């Protein structure tokens, strides 16, 4: 009866300036989930917060009321009015929802038509969620089965991770906008490391890397001997951007690192590269204020702006994204069977108790007329000899029909 | 297992051939047991009338049961298997039930000239009672036919085969004249022929019967007509004094052959010196050779078929509603018949439970006045645990069919 619902904003609809207001740091996922499960028609929840999407997966008692509650909650936490959110809201139920989260995890819904993508993020959601009570059987199962799908599709389609494609796209765009340009990367985590790899493969031999800690950059430097990596601590940020022509920002900061004030005071980029400083900001929330675009000699790009790249062997238009959909169609119906095989739990318990109410009444009825252990045992023996059979019968399609039968034949 | 109808009917076979297949009511039990004695025939019924001969069976295998029944038909009629094959009418399952519902209603598309066989269906069920082979599927089929026939009668008022045959007999006889009436046989059909003679204005009839009791009874119940009894041995003389002779005895051999009637003096010149034999008996009471006599005309139930059909259509009312009744009950029957596949699991379940119960009861009774209580506990627990699965295996027809049957397979798996 109860529905699994997906309720989201994605890059397919909402802009990054809208989407980043529903962004939920990993450290606040357990809090978010608890809040959602506090709503009257929501029993389980999970948040999938990535750069292309903010998606809330719930197990709702009522579809309509679940959607009203989660949407009102989105409005409260983000600051965004319900009316705006509804205009960009994405909504699917049950089979469509599991279908969706399978395509997302496989890389068949985001932005390039041949991508990872969210397999790493679906694993992170399962990790973080293990302690979280609200992350119950249904939604955890969905996500776990999404991990399975992600991996299968990955080996068939061989489609690179979403992290690989966004970083790849950042380098292509920078090289697109440029007519030796000085490269600078702020945030040496997974993504900035990827940006650096893509710059190397493009032939870049020197990059200045600004990071919170030096240790990460030390690792990367040790790991990539071929290129000259120059570490700079975060408080030297503004010096770096001024000695750079393009600035990649890839940090988990929840507030912009650059406002209009910071960049207008920066010396102009070299005329050799057109006199413009290209801020390529692949962070969500963004590390660059959109006001920076008011600065004449500056250019700002965010994840949404990687859409005018999307060019990398388009022949996977079918192959990858075709070989994968068959996987998705078989795993879905497999998962639905699995979901249906969960109501088998309330049945095993109940049926036992159903026979236990008959056993007790008849026992009691008899005892009003250690022979007492004899008849107690007789009453247990008859019942166990009737439960024992149905105990294992609760293939999976025959186990399912067994369950439905007991329910019809009893309660 | 399928329900099969295997028939010859006036749609294709003349009476000279049909009558060889005719099976008297006293021999239904023998025939059904002969039939059920075949390797693939679990149940059987014989529907013998003047327009048709139909065997209804429950067969293990469609082609094998049919070949076996066909052989039995040939073996009991004298008719070679290849002639029978030529005329053989065949329908399976839902088509067969639809068919028997129509025949019972007097709505057989292929035999338009017959009238309701409801009386004859009721008789088959009545005689079937004591007949081993007349099983639950076929008796059920026939009983449902009975219900359909009655409903359809109440809605359309299609006459019986009996009424419509005797009525056609008199009508035809009157069409062939521009008359001294004789009727041979005073049972159901002959009484009806007399009634239709009165209905038409006849005030005198010579009635030849084997026993007088029947004719005395008729004589008394119909005081307005002069009824002249005459023993069977005199029937030839009666013929020589009649201008039309109705024959309607259950004799399985002919009463008049050509030698008998070429002998007789010519019928009155006032009816055109032709003596009309209207023979409504199957098997025929009048030899066909009688038609070779120049001053004579013979007719049999085959010749009535058009005049029966015309009258049935003339008096036709509420055809659609009738066909609705048939379509719906057909599916209601299939529903009831699907329901029956639940009986074996019910018994197996009940044997299973009883074996557990006594086993556990004897355990307790080897460890111990109060023996009926401890007994009661055991049956009480079983019956109460079983009652749900026992009311969810019995249904009528609606939905719950698929569920009921899925409980069956589940109960099969879990035990
Ligand atoms: N990962 C993806 O699949 C994906 C794809 C595209 C874009 N993005 C976006 O890109 C950004 C980075 O993601 P990531 O996966 O690279 O993260 P990550 O591996 O966890 O590292 C984030 C980096 O940002 C730094 N950082 C964290 N908080 C900061 C703060 N408050 N101020 C300044 N620096 C801070 C960290 O420095 P330390 O090493 O010293 O801790 C680290 O180098 C995020 O906004 C993310 O949403 C993610
Ligand atoms: N009933 C129908 O719906 C139907 C329709 C059309 C035609 N028919 C045919 O018409 C014939 C009569 O049927 P029914 O239902 O009217 O019969 P019925 O009520 O059972 O009576 C049959 C009559 O035939 C006589 N009879 C029986 N055996 C005889 C024999 N060996 N020799 C001379 N007479 C004999 C009987 O004499 P007793 O009185 O002395 O016993 C009785 O008068 C049958 O051949 C039948 O197939 C039947």
Curated annotation (Swiss-Prot), chain A:
The keyword Oxidoreductase applies. Substrate binds at residues 50-53, 110, 115-117, 121. Pathway: Porphyrin-containing compound metabolism; chlorophyll biosynthesis; Porphyrin-containing compound metabolism; protoporphyrin-IX biosynthesis; 5-aminolevulinate from L-glutamyl-tRNA(Glu): step 1/2. NADP(+) binds at residues 187-192. GO terms for biological process: chlorophyll biosynthetic process; heme biosynthetic process; protoporphyrinogen IX biosynthetic process. One of its GO terms (cellular component) is chloroplast membrane. Negatively regulated by FLU and heme. Keywords: Chlorophyll biosynthesis, Chloroplast, Membrane, NADP, Oxidoreductase, Plastid, Porphyrin biosynthesis, Transit peptide. One of its GO terms (molecular function) is NADP binding. Its EC number is 1.2.1.70. It is found in: Plastid, Chloroplast membrane. Its main location: plastid. The record marks 100 as: Important for activity. It catalyses: (S)-4-amino-5-oxopentanoate + tRNA(Glu) + NADP(+) = L-glutamyl-tRNA(Glu) + NADPH + H(+). Induction: Circadian-regulation. Up-regulated by light. The active site is at 51 (nucleophile). Strongly expressed in photosynthetic tissues. Detected in all tissues tested. During catalysis, the active site Cys acts as a nucleophile attacking the alpha-carbonyl group of tRNA-bound glutamate with the formation of a thioester intermediate between enzyme and glutamate, and the concomitant release of tRNA(Glu). The thioester intermediate is finally reduced by direct hydride transfer from NADPH, to form the product GSA. The N-terminus (65-92) is required for heme inhibition, but not for activity. Part of the FLU-containing chloroplast membrane complex composed of FLU, CRD1, PORB, PORC, CHLP and HEMA1. Interacts (via C-terminus) with FLU, only in the absence of light. Interacts with GLUTRBP and forms a heterotetramer of two GLUTRBP and two HEMA1 subunits. Interacts with CLPF. Catalyzes the NADPH-dependent reduction of glutamyl-tRNA(Glu) to glutamate 1-semialdehyde (GSA). Probably involved in the tetrapyrrole synthesis required for the chlorophyll biosynthesis. Belongs to the glutamyl-tRNA reductase family. This is Glutamyl-tRNA reductase 1, chloroplastic. The gene is HEMA1. The chain holds residues 94 to 524 of 543 of the full protein.
């Amino acid at each position: 009866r109860s529905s699994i619902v997906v309720i989201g904003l994605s890059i397919h609809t909402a802009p990054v300036e809208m989407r980043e207001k529903l962004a939920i740091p990993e450290a606040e996922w357990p809090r978010a989930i608890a809040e959602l499960c506090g709503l009257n028609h929501i029993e389980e929840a999970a948040v999938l917060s990535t750069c292309n999407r903010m998606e809330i997966y719930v197990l709702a008692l009522s579809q309509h009321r679940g959607v009203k509650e989660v949407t009102e909650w989105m409005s409260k936490t983000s600051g965004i009015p319900v009316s705006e959110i509804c205009q960009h809201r994405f909504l699917l139920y049950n089979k469509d929802a599991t279908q969706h989260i399978f395509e997302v995890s496989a890389g068949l819904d985001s932005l390039v038509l041949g991508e990872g993508q969210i397999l790493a993020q679906v694993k992170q959601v399962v990790k973080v969620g293990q302690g979280v009570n609200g992350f119950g059987r249904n939604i955890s199962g969905l996500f776990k089965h999404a991990i399975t799908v992600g991996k299968r599709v990955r080996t068939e389609t061989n489609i690179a991770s979403g992290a690989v494609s966004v970083s790849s796209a950042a380098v292509e765009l920078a090289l697109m906008k440029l007519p030796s340009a000085r490269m600078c990367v702020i945030g040496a985590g997974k993504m900035g490391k990827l940006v650096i790899k893509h710059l190397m493969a493009k032939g870049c031999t020197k990059v200045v890397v600004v990071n919170r800690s030096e240790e990460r950059v030390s690792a990367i430097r040790e790991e990539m001997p071929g290129i000259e990596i120059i570490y700079r601590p975060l408080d030297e940020m503004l010096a770096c951007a001024s000695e750079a022509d393009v600035v990649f920002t890839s940090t988990a900061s929840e507030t912009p690192l650059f406002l209009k004030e910071h960049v207008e005071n920066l010396p102009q980029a070299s005329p050799e590269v057109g006199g413009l400083r290209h801020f390529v900001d692949i962070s969500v929330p963004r590390n660059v204020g959109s006001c920076v675009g008011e600065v004449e000699t500056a250019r700002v790009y965010n994840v949404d702006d990687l859409k005018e790249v999307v060019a990398a062997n388009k022949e996977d238009r079918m192959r990858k994204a075709m070989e994968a959909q068959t996987i998705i169609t078989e795993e879905s119906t497999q998962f639905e069977a699995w979901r249906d095989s969960l109501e088998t739990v309330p049945t095993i318990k109940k049926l036992r108790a159903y026979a236990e109410r008959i056993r007790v009444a008849e026992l009691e009825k008899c005892m009003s007329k250690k022979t007492t252990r004899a008849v107690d045992d007789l009453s247990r023996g008859i019942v166990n000899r009737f439960l024992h059979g149905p105990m294992q019968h609760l293939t999976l399609s025959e186990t399912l029909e067994n369950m439905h039968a007991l329910n019809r034949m009893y309660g």
